[PDB]
Design a protein around this ligand. Structure first.
Ligand SMILES: [Zn+2]
Ligand SMILES: [Zn+2]
Ligand SMILES: [Zn+2]
Ligand SMILES: [Zn+2]
Lengths: 131, 131
């Protein structure tokens, strides 16, 4: 249930919250900016303004419901959380985000981290290109 | 030339814009947060407020003069834009940024994008750790 998920994240149930979460769960909205999410809601006949979308996505960010990624100069995109680690390949023209998890890259990071006297705790990797 | 760089960026040549550009051009301030850059200007006895630093840095970013990196925990580090490839190892404790480049990672990245028919335009790689 979508009520339970909200309540279980310490977040009071409200209608904007439900409607924005609903959208976040749609297969094709797996990676999404506040603007795109707002536009979807418009197409869905809703009146939720973009400021609410932002306010809600922030609350979801802090509650651990979503993860915020800051893309190349400007764009924040959101996705629902998972323990399953991935990195991102981003098309600069199609608004398309491919997830990947390469073993060799994962391993190399650990060794570079250790080449310098750095204890690796987290990373982020974004590849951008034309599709 | 700084006056020229600003004009080429379509930006009015002002004193605040000059001084912040000068700090960014200093070797030991290559990767710098707005707060660090502000503090540095105070140490030079300049009269530029923290707000002005934020605003100008944003104009620079919009204008392609600087590149912004969002690091773990929601802080922005700035550097002057370059084509000179390097990636980032970031000490969460020290607040230092170590540059690195790794042939294997760079090769794997090319193979991954090719596999999804993306022509890479650029990429960011931030490794976070304790130092
Ligand atoms: Zn990864
Ligand atoms: Zn993702
Ligand atoms: Zn850099
Ligand atoms: Zn690289």
């Amino acid at each position: 249930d979508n009520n339970q998920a909200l309540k279980d994240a310490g977040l009071k149930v409200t209608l904007p919250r439900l409607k924005i979460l609903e959208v976040l769960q749609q297969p094709e909205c797996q990676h999404i900016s506040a603007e795109e999410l707002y536009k979807k809601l418009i197409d869905l006949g809703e009146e939720i303004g973009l400021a609410t979308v932002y306010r809600v996505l922030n609350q979801f960010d802090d509650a651990g419901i979503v993860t915020r990624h800051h893309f190349e100069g400007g764009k924040s995109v959101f996705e629902l959380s998972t323990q399953h680690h991935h990195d991102h390949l981003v098309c600069l023209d199609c608004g398309e985000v491919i997830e990947f998890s390469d073993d060799v890259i994962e391993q190399r990071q650990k060794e570079i981290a250790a080449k310098y006297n750095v204890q690796l705790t987290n990373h982020s990797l974004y590849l951008y290109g034309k599709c």
